[PDB]
Design an enzyme around this catalytic site. Structure first.
Site, PDB file in Angstrom:
ATOM      1  N   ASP A  35       0.820  -1.201   0.000  1.00  0.00           N
ATOM      2  CA  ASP A  35       0.000   0.000   0.000  1.00  0.00           C
ATOM      3  C   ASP A  35       0.860   1.259   0.000  1.00  0.00           C
ATOM      4  O   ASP A  35       1.347   1.680   1.047  1.00  0.00           O
ATOM      5  CB  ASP A  35      -0.899  -0.011   1.247  1.00  0.00           C
ATOM      6  CG  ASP A  35      -1.825   1.180   1.319  1.00  0.00           C
ATOM      7  OD1 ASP A  35      -1.943   1.897   0.305  1.00  0.00           O
ATOM      8  OD2 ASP A  35      -2.452   1.393   2.398  1.00  0.00           O
ATOM      9  N   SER A 199      -0.707  15.665 -12.042  1.00  0.00           N
ATOM     10  CA  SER A 199      -0.955  15.279 -13.419  1.00  0.00           C
ATOM     11  C   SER A 199      -1.196  16.544 -14.245  1.00  0.00           C
ATOM     12  O   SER A 199      -1.741  17.534 -13.752  1.00  0.00           O
ATOM     13  CB  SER A 199      -2.169  14.347 -13.481  1.00  0.00           C
ATOM     14  OG  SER A 199      -2.570  14.102 -14.806  1.00  0.00           O
TER      15      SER A 199
END
Length: 330
Positions: A35, A199
């Protein structure tokens, strides 16, 4: 040193991925959920409330000659999906894919929430976010990656998740045969303890690319792709009959649909998520309503590039003094 381990989907939907981890001496092998959005290595154990164990493999520290109680240390964690676990702490030898750390904090669960109990395939979590998020008190502990870093050939790990198929986590090297083209690297902020990056935009299907900054985290422990409501609405508007359902808890679409791809930007590069990756199947057995793999982050408080996005790429988690993230197509 290096390590290399195969990671395998737990079910036919890629709801999560498990990777075998050797703990203790002699080795006890548990299948953990790696994770990159948390920083605790915790396991089902001989200390876990018996009624909360249902099929998991447990770590028994009393059977390990290298286990030592970390006296006074406790831990307690709550995840974004509302699940939780807590317990006490041992140090022991932990190996992943041939890479060994001695003195690793292994957090033994005394209590786990129902979602963990109900998932017999996941024996615990191995956190790979920054150690500043680790929940051990009163002495915060380091992640497996942080402990291994100095010994690694290069201070990196990579995630290469499969679509309906096994993939690979590598430690300490970049497998140049595992991706196509070049890797594009992008800046990371560690201010919130995550692999947080921005992004450069998105496209829906064969549509034009929208240049827009989207701050989010690379999170292998989250199944879906969670993005701003504007972006998500633009995606689902291209699927006839798709709608957001408050009763179901997100966007659903007719199972008869063909889903468009979704592209996200990494600098000037582009990662394409095929439409099939966004199908999470019937909402309930036999339903013709299917659950979407792109969902709104509104009310999460952060955008999450979870498995839906990451499995479309070869992803480098660069843990150099100034961390960065790399993405390549594959």
């Amino acid at each position: 040193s290096t390590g290399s381990a195969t990671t395998t989907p737990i079910d036919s939907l890629d709801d999560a991925y498990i990777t075998p981890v050797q703990i203790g001496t002699p080795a006890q092998t548990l299948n953990l959920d790696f994770d990159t959005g948390s920083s605790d290595l915790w396991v089902f154990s001989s200390e876990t409330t018996a009624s909360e164990v249902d099929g998991q493999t447990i770590y028994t520290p009393s059977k390990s000659t290298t286990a030592k109680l970390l006296s006074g240390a406790t831990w307690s964690i709550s995840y974004g999906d509302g699940s939780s676990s807590s317990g006490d702490v041992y140090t022991d030898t932990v190996s992943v894919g041939g890479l060994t750390v001695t003195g690793q904090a292994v957090e033994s669960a005394k209590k786990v929430s129902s979602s963990f109990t109900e998932d017999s395939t996941i024996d615990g979590l191995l956190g790979l976010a920054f150690s500043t998020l680790n929940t051990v008190s009163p002495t915060q502990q380091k992640t497996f990656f942080d402990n291994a870093k100095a010994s690694l050939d290069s201070p990196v790990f990579t995630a290469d998740l499969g679509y309906h198929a096994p993939g690979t986590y590598n430690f300490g090297f970049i497998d140049t045969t595992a991706y196509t083209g070049s890797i594009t690297y992008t800046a990371v902020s560690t201010k919130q303890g995550f692999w947080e990056w921005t992004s450069t935009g998105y496209a829906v299907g064969s549509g034009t690319f929208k240049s827009t900054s989207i701050d989010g985290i690379a999170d292998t422990g989250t199944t879906l792709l969670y993005l701003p409501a504007t972006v998500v609405s633009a995606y689902w508007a291209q699927v006839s009959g798709a709608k957001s359902s408050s009763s179901v808890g997100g966007y659903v679409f007719p199972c008869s649909a063909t889903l468009p791809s979704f592209t996200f930007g990494v600098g000037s590069a582009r990662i394409v998520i095929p439409g099939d990756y966004i199908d999470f199947g019937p909402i309930s057995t036999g339903s013709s309503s299917c659950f979407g793999g792109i969902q709104s982050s509104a009310g999460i408080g952060i955008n999450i590039f979870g498995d839906v996005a990451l499995k479309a790429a070869f992803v480098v988690f660069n843990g150099a003094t100034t961390p960065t993230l790399g993405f390549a197509s594959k």
